[PDB]
Amino acid sequence: GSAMGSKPLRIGVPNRVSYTDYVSKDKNPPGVRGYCIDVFEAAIELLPYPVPRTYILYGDGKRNPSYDNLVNEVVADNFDVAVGDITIVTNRTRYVDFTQPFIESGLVVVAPVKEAGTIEGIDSLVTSNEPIGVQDGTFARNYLINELNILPSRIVPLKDEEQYLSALQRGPNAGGVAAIVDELPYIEVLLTNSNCKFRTVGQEFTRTGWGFAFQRDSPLAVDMSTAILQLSEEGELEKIHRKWLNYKHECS
Amino acid sequence: GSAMGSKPLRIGVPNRVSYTDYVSKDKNPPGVRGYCIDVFEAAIELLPYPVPRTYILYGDGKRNPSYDNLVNEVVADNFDVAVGDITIVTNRTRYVDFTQPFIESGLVVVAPVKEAGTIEGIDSLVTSNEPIGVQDGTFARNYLINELNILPSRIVPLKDEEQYLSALQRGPNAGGVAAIVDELPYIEVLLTNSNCKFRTVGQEFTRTGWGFAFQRDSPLAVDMSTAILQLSEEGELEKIHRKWLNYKHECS
Ligand code: MET
Ligand code: MET
Numbered sequence A, B: 001g002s003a004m005g006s007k008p009l010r011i012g013v014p015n016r017v018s019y020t021d022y023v024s025k026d027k028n029p030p031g032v033r034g035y036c037i038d039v040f041e042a043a044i045e046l047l048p049y050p051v052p053r054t055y056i057l058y059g060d061g062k063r064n065p066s067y068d069n070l071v072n073e074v075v076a077d078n079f080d081v082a083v084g085d086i087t088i089v090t091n092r093t094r095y096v097d098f099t100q101p102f103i104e105s106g107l108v109v110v111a112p113v114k115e116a117g118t119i120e121g122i123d124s125l126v127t128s129n130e131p132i133g134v135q136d137g138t139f140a141r142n143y144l145i146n147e148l149n150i151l152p153s154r155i156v157p158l159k160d161e162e163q164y165l166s167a168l169q170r171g172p173n174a175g176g177v178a179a180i181v182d183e184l185p186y187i188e189v190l191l192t193n194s195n196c197k198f199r200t201v202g203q204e205f206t207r208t209g210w211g212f213a214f215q216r217d218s219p220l221a222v223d224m225s226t227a228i229l230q231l232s233e234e235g236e237l238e239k240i241h242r243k244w245l246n247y248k249h250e251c252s
């Protein structure tokens, strides 16, 4: 028979430094772990064929990587798919084939309880002219600039939960921020870990989801969408969510 | 030049008899109207090419049609796309290319306020062994049978809001139902129209969305996903929702 085997699926995984229960490196094989990995693996198990595969970390592990640049590594055929907390953003859908979403997402505004008289949602945050914290690597920076008219110098990238919390604590007049804008799944973890001093203010002002980003015209995208919906109806997406994420805390 | 022109996009539209603000017939061109039509048209306007098209009603206009059978008309190449309140259901994703969802959906349980001591959610409804009302034509009938273990004789199809409300009023011992199981967008309208006697009980026990169902490998599916996300970020999906749907009512 023919000697040369098939190339495995090259899975690009963001090397998260913050909110690592969603996806992160693992010192043990397969070298990655977290909510989004367990969903991907559960969905692969439901496909009607084997999928030899390997997970490749993306990012220096000092700051969250650029997710736009991770998706463009799929477009450029360095990876076959991006697997993680990958938001289904308008520009990214022009060049990759996302699955149907495996979890809902959207942007929210987080501020101190004591500041919710002046910062009550995205509109008041916009007109405040004060600094806005965001994660490193998120779509949300360009979203705020292009869709919400935020002057770029107002946007302050922050490294990790310790810096999200210290920036909100200092506030807009002492070298911090008026608010953090971030997706609700992350903020659920932040509010679990910050002792009831911070809150969401106003509406979830966008609606999106996370998906796996395959190359254009990928048959795997089609079959993995069916598999995600099967996990959803089996209750497995909720069971996997409950394994990795818990938002209960001491101050209720 | 060549005389024979191109065939227009054949759009199959469910001829809804209930909840007609989502999609329904219109005595005026283009012969259909409602939330889902305005979203589809707004998304077509954003594509970078013209899409000559026509809307074709599906159903006798006496009862809501089978949505599985409407989707299978796309699979069988009688329509190019199904446009309306089309839930992204596991079996349908095996044969059509849905867009990314334009609205979130999920199943809920609706019961009288006075019955919420015995019917408190899907689990208690299951073990009650009482009759369950559903719409004509919905995925929810087979979902309840196959995913929730409901004996088929328990499921009672109902025609329209007058019959949804009368079945809940009669209740399970006088030729009615213990509860209605239906998707949250419909129940938001039902609760707008039923004078605070009924309520949702328990968790939204599934998570899905509505999408436009194109044929497999359709480039329009790809480009209409990008367009839906553009509408989402422009605020147009919310503006179109506010045009067609209002859930405020006299008893609050
Ligand atoms: C690195 S922060 C979170 C990234 C976000 N989910 C995105 O896809 O842009
Ligand atoms: C005719 S009731 C509602 C139908 C449902 N949205 C489906 O797609 O099955």
Ligand code: NA
Pocket: A032, A033, A034, A035, A037, A038
């Ligand atoms: Na894992």
Ligand code: NA
Pocket: A088, A101, A208, A209, B100, B101
């Ligand atoms: Na989406």
Ligand code: NA
Pocket: B032, B033, B034, B035, B037, B038
């Ligand atoms: Na219309």
Ligand code: NA
Pocket: A100, A101, B088, B101, B208, B209
């Ligand atoms: Na979906």
